[PDB]
């Protein structure tokens, strides 16, 4: 009943807060300026990028360096998402081969979902909200890097319109991970049994937490089908980038994921 679905929504929220250091809550505070913390270092060109090495973690050319930065962080995201998934009741009880497959396909969908939390039409928060890299700066990069992040901005503008909060996103993300239709699953039934349960939890959350916004649930499920198309575009631009660029190596964990994908 309602109770069991509120308890799930709560369990998932608590787990989301632990798994993800920078929530949408903190992210919005920073972007509006309503924080009592220092405004983040604005990176708008090669000069400001250079001056802003003192706030980022890179551990040879600009576009490539930015991509190595985005690559480092993107690996920490997979680890955060992986620990979150382990908290989704019954996810661990699944076939370990299924757990891998769900994550393999799910993480990019969830990375673009949670990127939108850090985005506005002008730019994206980086290095745990203490940097802000502008959209125009990322467009102005030389191709193929020129329009690598642009489709994420386009999505985030539309997605942020739904004004979802952390408690909504916690469940939305769980629903994306438990997609019983990922290529190469072995035991679909117990995946769908959990997603079914998560979708009720999500629907109830959206009624309680946005009782003026009607069929936000419907709108949100339409967006979930956009992400796939959007993630395929991304996978192929990366496919291209792997080939055309000789110098830069791709991180092992990313290679695990992207190999045998679409």
């Amino acid at each position: 009943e309602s109770a069991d679905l509120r308890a799930l929504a709560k369990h998932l929220y608590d787990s989301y807060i632990k798994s993800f250091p920078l929530t949408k809550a903190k992210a919005r505070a920073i972007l509006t300026g309503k924080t009592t913390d220092k405004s983040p270092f604005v990176i708008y060109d090669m000069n400001s990028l250079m001056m802003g090495e003192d706030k980022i973690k890179f551990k040879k050319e600009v576009a490539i360096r930015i991509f190595q930065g985005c690559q480092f962080r993107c690996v920490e995201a997979v680890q955060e998402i992986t620990e979150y998934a382990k908290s989704i009741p019954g996810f661990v009880n699944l076939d370990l081969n299924d757990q891998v497959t769900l994550l393999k396909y799910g993480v990019h969908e969830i990375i673009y979902t949670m990127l939108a939390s850090l985005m506005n039409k002008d730019g994206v928060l980086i290095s745990e909200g203490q940097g802000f890299m502008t959209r125009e700066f990322l467009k102005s990069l030389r191709k193929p890097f020129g329009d690598f992040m642009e489709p994420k901005f386009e999505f985030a503008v539309k997605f942020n319109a739904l004004e979802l909060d952390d408690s909504d996103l916690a469940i939305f993300i769980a629903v994306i991970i438990l997609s019983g239709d990922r290529p190469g699953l072995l035991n679909v039934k117990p995946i769908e049994d959990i997603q079914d349960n998560l979708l009720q939890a999500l629907e109830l959350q959206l009624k309680l937490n946005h009782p003026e916004s009607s069929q936000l649930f419907a709108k949100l499920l339409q967006k979930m089908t956009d992400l796939r198309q959007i993630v395929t575009e991304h996978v192929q631009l990366l496919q291209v980038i792997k080939k055309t660029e000789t110098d830069m190596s791709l991180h092992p964990l990313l290679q695990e994921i992207y190999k045998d994908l679409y």
């Binding site: 997979v78 680890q79 992986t82 620990e83 382990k86 757990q99 994550l103 964990l253 695990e256």
Partner: peptide, 11 residues
Amino acid sequence: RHKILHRLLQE
């Protein structure tokens, strides 16, 4: 065979 994903799930 997804060694790192395997380890991240196992850990």
